[PDB]
């Protein structure tokens with residue numbers, strides 16, 4: 001028993017992290033087979049990053065402008081190219097630690113593990129959710145760019161996030177591994193800000209099911225609402241509408257606890273209106289929305 | 302910026318996890334050089350574990366009663382022995398992934414990362430504190446025994462916890478890697494319960510410093526208390542007394558924020574007496590005590 005915020009074991013991804021240096025800038029790259037993936041803003045000069053033209057900047061580079069270090073051994077770049085906001089560096093050595101992997105673009109509300117790295121060296125691992133406003137609430141310092149987020153599915157590593165920048169509110173923005181930003185953000189230093197967030201309803205409900213599986217029942221009641229009357233409550237408290245798809249995704253947890261989804265919704269409704277009154281749920285005094293139904297199943301059985 | 306509950310990267314420890322089978326019981330072992338470490342209760346029968354005599358049980362075993370699998374390749378045991386509550390299995394193959402490592406017995410209040418495993422295979426990683434009552438609030442299912450807790454210090458893995466059992470309140474108890482239980486617990490199925498806990502004061506204060514470094518200042522005030530008058534408040538709210546040693550450990554964080562420890566204590570005092578009034582600190586609506594001063598420094602610079 002017990003319920004903790006859990007990341008995937010990071011070993012398979014640790015073997016892929018390298019350091020990429022271009023001129024004065026250093027950040028992390030992902031070394032998969034004979035290609036290194038990293039943010040394209042590594043080729044930005046400190047002056048020409050208010051509005052850079054990346055196709056010109058890259059045409060003016062050559063393979064010897066890029067220094068790649070796997071551990072201590074230097075990697076020689078034999079080709080370079082750009083795909084959206086990621087730079088791709090062909091190296092002469094295939095990574096012998098390359099796992100089975102996929103590139104996946106995730107939906108808001110999904111979670112992943114982040115392996116924060118500095119200078120090619122993994123520093124720590126933690127779990128993150130893609131917020132509805134396409135930011136993540138990470139923990140990233142200077143030099144963390146190129147750190148990746150990932151999920152694991154029977155030794156296949158699904159990479160889904162590469163880190164590029166911090167927004168003014170302290171939250172973070174980046175791309176999928178094919179270089180497309182999540183959300184409306186762009187890789188130039190301008191006035192882009194995170195939009196207003198909403199709470200991921202299906203995750204809050206999954207977390208309430210984890211609380212039930214772990215013995216916290218004080219918030220249950222006998223009431224049952226309908227979908228339509230619940231979503232009116234969600235709108236008032238800035239929660240994502242509950243869809244039929246979400247109800248069905250919650251099925252296994254509903255079956256394991258014997259509490260129907262719409263029964264669990266009438267408990268959430270009471271919590272939103274009356275608060276917790278000094279009680280906690282799974283060690284928290286607020287409603288938590290960064291556990292997917294999948295995360296709950298994986299940890300509660 | 303940002304502050305997240307962060308585990309150490311688990312790769313160095315993943316390469317050490319094996320599966321140990323004795324009769325009908327299966328749990329995880331730690332394969333370091335040519336020795337496998339696991340809980341000694343793996344040799345317990347389901348009937349003779351209300352009060353077992355482990356020296357007799359082990360005398361009645363032979364090397365072929367133990368099955369060790371590293372991945373898929375079976376390991377042959379060429380020796381066995383017992384040290385306190387851990388079993389040690391000599392195998393004929395040294396682990397070629399053996400990192401630089403130490404065995405360390407930690408103090409309450411210290412944190413470590415837990416690599417939860419089932420059947421020798423790492424499942425997830427999370428951070429834990431040794432509570433003052435020598436339990437940990439983990440997340441462990443059947444078959445998790447032998448999962449280890451560890452810290453990393455420049456590629457030297459310091460193992461400090463091996464998992465043995467769940468207590469009635471859902472918290473967890475285990476040993477150091479030399480087989481000595483943390484706390485008063487013993488490895489037989491009896492009526493042992495966790496004692497009353499206390500909050501780790503020095504950690505709460507480190508977490509308040511992390512909040513300041515990250516822009517949460519609404520709880521600061523101009524008051525400054527003394528050590529003696531603070532510890533009277535700690536006693537009333539079930540907090541560990543603040544020692545002079547703790548004050549000095551908080552020095553670097555005090556220096557980085559320019560807020561003296563005894564200044565930060567007068568903010569904690571106000572929070573304990575008046576609560577948060579619907580505000581949060583680093584995304585939490587209660588005071589958090591599972592970040593050491595070291596964890597804060599490592600993540601805030």
Ligand SMILES: *[C@H](O)[C@H](C[C@@H]1CCNC1=O)NC(=O)[C@H](CC1CCCCC1)NC(=O)OCc1ccccc1
Pocket residue numbers: 027041044049140141142143144145146164165166167172186187188189302
């Ligand atoms: C890459 O390593 C950093 C990571 C940032 C710095 C602190 N926390 C992070 O997540 N990325 C950058 O510094 C960005 C570089 C720009 C990105 C757009 C194209 C040109 C280059 N800038 C950035 O994140 O700006 C905000 C910021 C906040 C706090 C400290 C520094 C910068």
Ligand SMILES: *[C@H](O)[C@H](C[C@@H]1CCNC1=O)NC(=O)[C@H](CC1CCCCC1)NC(=O)OCc1ccccc1
Pocket residue numbers: 001328342345350441442443444445446447465466467468473487488489490
């Ligand atoms: C080993 O893999 C398990 C891990 C436990 C089970 C669920 N969560 C855990 O942390 N350990 C055990 O099952 C213990 C075995 C005993 C330990 C004392 C010596 C004889 C063998 N027992 C145990 O933890 O009992 C409590 C319990 C709670 C919930 C489910 C099962 C057991």
